[PDB]
Structure formats: structure tokens, C-alpha cells
Amino acid sequence: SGFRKMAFPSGKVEGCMVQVTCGTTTLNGLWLDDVVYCPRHVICTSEDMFNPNYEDLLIRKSNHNFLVQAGNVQLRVIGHSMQNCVLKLKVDTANPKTPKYKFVRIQPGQTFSVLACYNGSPSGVYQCAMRPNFTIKGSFLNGSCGSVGFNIDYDCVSFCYMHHMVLPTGVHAGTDLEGNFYGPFVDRQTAQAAGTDTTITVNVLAWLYAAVINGDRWFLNRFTTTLNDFNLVAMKYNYEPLTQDHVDILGPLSAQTGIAVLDMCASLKELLQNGMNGRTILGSALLEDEFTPFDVVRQCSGVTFQ
Amino acid sequence: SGFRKMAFPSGKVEGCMVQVTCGTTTLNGLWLDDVVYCPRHVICTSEDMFNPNYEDLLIRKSNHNFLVQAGNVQLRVIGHSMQNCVLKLKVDTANPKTPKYKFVRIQPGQTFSVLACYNGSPSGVYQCAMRPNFTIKGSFLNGSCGSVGFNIDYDCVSFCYMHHMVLPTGVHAGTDLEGNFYGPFVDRQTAQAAGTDTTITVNVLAWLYAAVINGDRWFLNRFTTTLNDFNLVAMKYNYEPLTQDHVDILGPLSAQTGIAVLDMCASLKELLQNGMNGRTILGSALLEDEFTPFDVVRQCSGVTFQ
Numbered sequence: 001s002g003f004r005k006m007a008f009p010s011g012k013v014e015g016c017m018v019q020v021t022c023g024t025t026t027l028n029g030l031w032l033d034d035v036v037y038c039p040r041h042v043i044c045t046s047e048d049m050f051n052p053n054y055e056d057l058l059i060r061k062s063n064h065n066f067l068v069q070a071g072n073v074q075l076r077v078i079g080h081s082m083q084n085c086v087l088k089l090k091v092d093t094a095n096p097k098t099p100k101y102k103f104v105r106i107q108p109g110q111t112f113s114v115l116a117c118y119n120g121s122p123s124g125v126y127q128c129a130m131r132p133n134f135t136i137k138g139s140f141l142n143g144s145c146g147s148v149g150f151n152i153d154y155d156c157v158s159f160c161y162m163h164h165m166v167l168p169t170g171v172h173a174g175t176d177l178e179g180n181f182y183g184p185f186v187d188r189q190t191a192q193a194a195g196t197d198t199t200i201t202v203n204v205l206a207w208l209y210a211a212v213i214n215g216d217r218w219f220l221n222r223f224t225t226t227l228n229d230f231n232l233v234a235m236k237y238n239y240e241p242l243t244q245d246h247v248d249i250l251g252p253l254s255a256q257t258g259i260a261v262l263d264m265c266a267s268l269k270e271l272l273q274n275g276m277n278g279r280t281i282l283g284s285a286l287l288e289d290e291f292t293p294f295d296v297v298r299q300c301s302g303v304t305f306q
Numbered sequence: 307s308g309f310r311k312m313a314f315p316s317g318k319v320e321g322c323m324v325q326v327t328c329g330t331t332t333l334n335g336l337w338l339d340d341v342v343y344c345p346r347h348v349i350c351t352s353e354d355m356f357n358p359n360y361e362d363l364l365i366r367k368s369n370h371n372f373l374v375q376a377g378n379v380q381l382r383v384i385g386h387s388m389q390n391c392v393l394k395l396k397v398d399t400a401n402p403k404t405p406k407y408k409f410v411r412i413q414p415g416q417t418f419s420v421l422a423c424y425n426g427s428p429s430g431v432y433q434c435a436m437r438p439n440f441t442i443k444g445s446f447l448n449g450s451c452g453s454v455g456f457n458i459d460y461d462c463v464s465f466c467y468m469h470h471m472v473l474p475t476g477v478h479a480g481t482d483l484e485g486n487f488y489g490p491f492v493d494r495q496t497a498q499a500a501g502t503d504t505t506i507t508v509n510v511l512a513w514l515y516a517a518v519i520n521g522d523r524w525f526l527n528r529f530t531t532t533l534n535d536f537n538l539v540a541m542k543y544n545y546e547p548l549t550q551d552h553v554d555i556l557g558p559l560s561a562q563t564g565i566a567v568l569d570m571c572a573s574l575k576e577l578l579q580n581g582m583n584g585r586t587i588l589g590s591a592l593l594e595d596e597f598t599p600f601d602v603v604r605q606c607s608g609v610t611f612q
Contacts, residue, residue, distance in 0.1 A: 001476045004445040006430035009421065011317030071612070115315065121610035124312035125431060137589070139310040141608045170307045170521065215476065283443070285591035302447045304427035306377070 003210055003282050005290065006299055007113040007127045008152040015097035018075070019120030020089065020146065021067040028117045028146030029068060029089070030159070030177070032098050036068050036075070036089040037177060038146045039164045040082055041187050049189040058082055069120065070095075084179025085164065085187050100156040103177040108132045109200040109240070111292050112149040112160050119143060129203070129290040130161075132240060133195040134183025135171040138163070149174075152305045167192055199289050201239045202246040205264055206293040209253040211282045213300055218279060220259070223266035230265045237272050249293050309516055309588050311596065312605055313419040313433045314458040321403035324381070325426030326395065326452065327373040334423045334452030335374060335395070336465070336483070338404050342374050342381070342395040343483060344452045345470045346388055347493050355495040364388055375426065376401075390485025391470065391493050406462040409483040414438045415506040415546070417598050418455040418466050425449060435509070435596040436467075438546060439501040440489025441477040444469070455480075458611045473498055505595050507545045508552040511570055512599040515559040517588045519606055524585060526565070529572035536571045543578050555599050 020029040020038045024045065029038035043061060044052050061080075066089055068075040079090030106112065111129045115122055116139060128136050128149075140147070140163055149161030163174040164187050171194060173185040185192055212220065231241045242265065250261045268287075276285055297303075326335040326344045330351065335344035349367060350358050367386075372395055374381040385396030412418065417435045421428055422445060434442050434455075446453070446469055455467030469480040470493050477500060479491040491498055518526065537547045548571065556567045574593075582591055603609075 001447070001472050002443060002445045002478065004430075004432040004434070004443075005311060006422070006432050006445060007313055009316045009320050009428040009431055011315075011320040011428075014315050014317040116312070118608045118610045121612050122315040122317075123608065123610045124310075124605070125315055126310040126312050128310070137308060137310075139308045139312060139605060141307070141606075143608065166307050172308065280592070286586070299430070299445060300447075302424045302429065302449065304424045304429045306427050 003214055005127050007125045010115050010125045012099040012157050013115050014122050017117050017120055018068055018070040030148050031095045034091050034094040038087050040085050040087045085175050086179035102158055104158045104160050105176045106160045112151050114149045117147045132198045135194055138172045140172055155306050198238045198240050201242050203289040204287050206296045207288045207291050210296045212257050216281050219267050221267055224263055225266040233269050309520055311433050313431045316421050316431045318405040318463050319421050320428050323423050323426055324374055324376040336454050337401045340397050340400040344393050346391050346393045391481050392485035408464055410464045410466050411482045412466045418457050420455045423453045438504045441500055444478045446478055461612050504544045504546050507548050509595040510593050512602045513594045513597050516602045518563050522587050525573050527573055530569055531572040539575050
């Protein structure tokens with residue numbers, strides 16, 4: 001009973017956060033096995049940020065210029081290299097707390113947990129979605145860069161995100177763990193264009209199902225509609241178009257609630273056209289889009305991790 | 307930049323969760339030093355829940371009737387006793403992962419993180435508030451009982467909550483770590499009256515300050531008001547009355563934003579009387595009350611834990 005924006009437990013990631021300091025800049029790194037991953041702009045000063053030549057800057061740096069520390073443990077850099085926008089600092093000590101992990105590149109609309117850190121120390125954890133314009137609406141202050149996003153599948157941590165920049169519009173941009181940015185962004189302090197932030201329609205539908213499961217049913221009508229008629233209305237309100245893949249992914253929720261996907265679409269369309277009236281759904285006056293169908297199944301079933 | 311409902315990192319609590327099984331009932335326990343804390347209704351069947359005599363039920367149980375396991379580690383109960391509504395299971399092995407901790411009883415309006423568990427394994431973490439009617443709006447399924455709420459102060463885990471019941475209205479009730487319920491609730495499956503759920507006014511004000519800090523300023527007027535005139539309007543909308551202690555606690559936020567507390571009160575009153583109009587504040591169409599003034603200072607400053 002009840003529904004909450006739930007994060008994954010962060011214990012297996014807390015033990016991988018380190019502090020990386022090169023010159024005067026200090027940010028967070030991810031220590032897995034005997035390598036530390038961090039944003040390459042750790043080698044920049046605040047002045048170099050407006051037009052850095054990362055090749056030129058990196059070459060006037062040696063192994064002993066990078067100070068990595070895990071708590072009061074001082075690590076020794078014995079090799080460094082640049083992979084896209086992340087710096088891989090090869091150290092001598094493998095992390096004894098390295099969990100089973102993999103690097104994954106997620107798609108827009110997927111959700112993950114962010115462990116926000118400062119100077120290598122965890123501060124808080126929250127759940128968010130990759131927006132369709134490849135930004136995230138996070139909570140980051142100066143020095144939070146290198147904080148990572150993750151999922152916990154089975155007993156394995158799936159690292160999917162590392163924070164690099166705050167854009168002038170206040171939103172956040174970052175890379176995967178191979179150093180490739182999500183979206184068209186670059187690690188350069190300049191005016192960068194983010195596109196239209198649309199609503200993740202399939203996620204809204206998963207949340208409506210979660211509401212029905214929890215007893216919030218006032219929005220249900222017996223109206224129906226088709227994919228095309230729904231998408232016409234969705235496109236008018238800056239909603240992502242629904243495809244047949246999305247209908248399939250809502251299948252298990254349709255089965256457990258007895259409500260057809262296209263019937264739920266017809267309820268959503270009326271909410272788009274006529275509004276919430278001032279009612280709420282699961283304690284919210286807005287349509288929520290940061291739960292995937294899997295998050296809903298996870299939470300309404302009681303899936304645990306180890 | 308940005309604002310999120312942030313939970314504390316859960317690593318130091320994950321290593322204290324165990325599974326407790328007595329007879330056919332299995333729920334979660336909290337393993338600190340050489341004692342396991344769990345809800346005493348672990349000794350009930352589903353049938354005994356409507357009128358249990360915990361004294362009578364407990365006396366037909368011995369040490370070897372309680373099976374406590376931490377992962378694939380089997381613990382041995384060498385002593386048991388009932389303290390109010392929690393069972394203290396004395397075991398032979400002290401937890402090697404016992405953090406610095408204390409037990410605290412929080413007051414309504416305070417916030418904490420809940421680690422939702424099933425069968426001793428963590429499932430997710432979220433942040434919530436103790437409502438003024440001593441319930442919490444959580445996310446709990448069957449078998450989540452014994453899940454605990456906590457804060458992280460400095461390097462010390464402050465345990466403040468343990469989940470015991472879901473009420474027929476769908477909300478959740480629990481105890482402190484001494485076994486005393488929050489509110490007038492009892493560990494008995496019966497119709498129980500929860501009072502009026504009012505809005506935590508001081509928390510709303512702290513969140514308005516957070517909005518101004520983050521650039522959301524459209525609700526600011528130069529109107530002013532007094533405590534009494536504000537409380538007259540607040541009481542009409544089921545808002546908790548603001549006292550001078552609350553004004554003092556908003557002091558640091560007033561200083562950093564240059565906006566007087568009574569001025570912020572005048573803005574809030576207009577929002578109560580005229581509504582949101584359809585605008586939003588920090589991405590929300592409703593007035594948010596699950597951030598304390600301390601949460602706001604914490605998040606907008608970058609406080610880290612160890």
C-alpha cells in the first residue's frame with residue numbers, strides 16, 4: 001500500500017566513491033578494481049573551462065599530479081589515460097569493496113538512482129529519469145561532479161551516468177561510464193542548447209496503473225481510443241508518441257489490473273484535454289513521468305536486492 | 307542548482323538488516339551489537355492479529371523458536387524479552403558492521419529516511435515526514451514490517467522509526483526503537499482512528515525559501531502580515547499554526563535570502579487564498595511540506611556524511 005519515488009539502496013556504491021584532486025580542483029571519482037573513473041575536467045582550472053584543449057592540458061601532467069584518496073586512505077596513481085570525457089586513473093590498490101558491476105548506456109525515459117557526493121563523501125540519494133532531451137533534473141552543487149547514477153539488477157550494480165556539468169538553464173548534463181555524453185553536450189562552459197523537454201508517455205501510463213492498483217480510480221472511463229487518435233492528442237501537449245513496443249511493455253500491468261492499455265490511453269487523453277480539475281492522483285496534482293513500467297512492477301511486488 | 311526529495315545514504319543501515327522468523331511469520335529485524343530488534347507481532351499468526359495477548363503468546367516460546375539470519379549467516383538466540391511493542395532477541399554474535407548509532411524519538415513534522423526491506427533484504431530508500439497525526443505515507447507491502455527509519459547526523463545513525471502496521475485507511479503506523487508507538491495506535495488488526503492530517507506550515511515556508519534560492523520567485527509579494535493574522539488564515543486551510551520557535555528556526559534561511567519570515571508568510575497566505583493559478587513551484591503544483599528547514603540548509607549547502 002502507498003507509492004513513493006523510491007531509490008535503490010546505495011551501500012554498494014558508497015564504498016566506491018573517492019576524492020580526486022589535480023592541482024586546485026577536487027571532485028568525485030568512482031573506484032572499481034584498480035582504476036579510478038572521474039570527469040576529465042578535473043585537470044582544468046575555473047579559467048580553462050571556457051575553452052579547454054584537454055589534450056594540451058593533460059600532457060603537462062604526470063602520474064604524481066593526481067591525488068586520489070578514499071577516506072583517509074591515499075592511493076597511488078601508476079598510469080593515466082583519457083577515454084572520451086572521462087579520465088581513467090590506474091592505481092596500485094584494487095578496491096576491496098568492488099561489487100559485481102557493469103557499465104551500461106541507458107535510453108531516454110529510463111530511471112536510475114543518483115548518489116550525490118562532495119569531496120568523495122556521500123550526501124544523499126534520489127531517483128530520476130533521463131529526460132527525452134538527454135538532461136536530468138537533479139540536485140547538484142559546486143564540487144558534486146563525478147557523482148554517479150546507477151541501477152541495481154539482481155546482485156549487480158549497473159553504472160549508467162556520471163555528472164559533468166550544470167548548464168546555464170540550471171539543468172544537468174553528464175556521460176556514461178565510457179565518457180560519451182548523453183545528448184549533444186560538451187564539457188565546456190558555454191551556452192549550450194537543450195531541446196524540448198517532452199513528457200514520457202509510457203511512464204505516465206505505468207503510473208496511472210500504479211494509481212489504480214492503490215485505489216485511485218476516479219479518472220477511469222469506459223471510453224476507448226486507438227494509437228493514432230491518442231498520438232494526435234499527445235503530440236499537441238508535448239507528449240512522447242506511444243508505439244507498439246510501449247503497449248507490449250505495459251502488458252503485465254494490463255494483466256494484473258484487468259484494464260486494457262488502449263482504455264488507459266483514453267483516460268489519459270481526457271486528463272490532457274480537461275485537466276485535473278483540482279483532484280490529485282497518488283498525492284500529486286501533476287501527471288508523473290519518472291516511474292517506468294518496471295519500477296511500478298518492482299515496487300508493487302516487493303523485489304529485493306542482494 | 308535544482309531541488310530533489312533526497313534520502314540519506316543507506317549503506318550503514320543495509321548492514322544491520324536481518325530476517326527474523328518465528329513459526330510461520332517472517333519479517334525484518336535490526337541487528338545492532340549482539341541484539342536483534344523486531345516487531346513483537348512476529349510471534350502472531352495472521353489469525354492471532356485481531357486480538358493478541360502478547361504475554362500469553364510469548365510465554366509458549368523459547369529461545370530456539372526464533373530463527374534470525376543475516377544473509378546466509380544463521381544467528382543463535384540466547385535470550386529474549388519484550389520491551390513495549392518490540393522484541394529484543396539477544397544473540398551470540400555482535401554485528402561486525404554495527405555503526406555508531408543512537409535511538410531517538412522524533413516529533414511530528416520531522417523527516418527521516420526509510421529503508422524498505424523484505425525478508426531481511428533491502429529493496430529501496432525514500433524520504434518522508436512524520437505527519438501531525440503520527441502516521442506516515444509510506445510504501446509498504448506484506449512482509450515489510452520491521453523496516454526502519456533513520457537520520458544520519460555526523461557519522462552517527464539516528465534510528466527513529468520501525469514499521470509495524472498498515473491501517474485500513476492505507477496509511478502506516480509504527481514505533482520508536484524502544485517499542486512505543488507514535489500516536490494512539492496499537493499492534494492489533496482493528497479499526498483505528500487517525501486524526502486530521504494537517505499541513506506542516508514551517509516546512510512549507512522552508513520550501514518556499516528553497517524555491518527563491520533556486521530562482522522561482524513569482525509568488526513573492528511585498529505584502530506583510532503578523533503571526534496572528536497569518537494563523538487565522540492558516541487554521542482555515544488545516545495548516546499547523548506558526549509559533550515564534552518556528553520563526554527562529556527559519557532565521558538562517560531569512561538571512562541568506564534577504565526575505566523576512568513574516569514577508570514569506572504573507573506570500574504563502576495569498577497562495578492559500580488564491581491558489582497556484584496553474585503555475586508550479588520547484589516543479590510542483592501543490593505546496594510541499596516534507597522538507598524541514600534543516601533539510602533545505604543541508605541540501606543547498608552540500609553537507610556530507612561519513
